[PDB]
């Protein structure tokens, strides 16, 4: 058949091909519209009304 033997490490390498079928889509990031929210850093922070309001302190 005029076929030569390949080398000893021909099939152990990474093989790259062009596939006829389309690739499967990467999963979208999970969405959580009602998450656990925190205080944002751009929220305004005025001084507290009547101080601590805890046992006569202010």
């Amino acid at each position: 058949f005029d076929w030569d033997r390949p080398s000893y490490g021909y099939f152990s390498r990474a093989k790259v091909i062009q596939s006829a079928r389309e690739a499967p889509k990467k999963e979208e990031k999970v969405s959580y519209p009602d998450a656990t929210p925190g205080l944002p850093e751009d929220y305004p922070k005025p001084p507290a009304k009547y101080g601590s309001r805890f046992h006569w302190l202010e």
Partner: protein, 62 residues
């Protein structure tokens, strides 16, 4: 009038203390806010170990 001012201040302090009592009760009932009753759990170490196992797949070979 000093009694009037002190009574206004103490009544507003009592109202804010009652309001923060209901706010803390509703916050601890449903665990909604990140500040007081939130017990934080992170998925940082699972992502770190999955990323390390992803780099270790490239280094398998000879």
């Amino acid at each position: 009038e000093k009694s009037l001012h002190y009574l206004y201040e103490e009544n507003e302090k009592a109202q804010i203390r009652l309001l923060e009592d209901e706010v803390r009760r509703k916050m601890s009932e449903r665990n909604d806010y990140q500040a007081y009753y939130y017990r934080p759990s992170v998925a940082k170490y699972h992502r770190i170990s999955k990323e390390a196992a992803d780099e270790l797949e490239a280094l398998r070979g000879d």
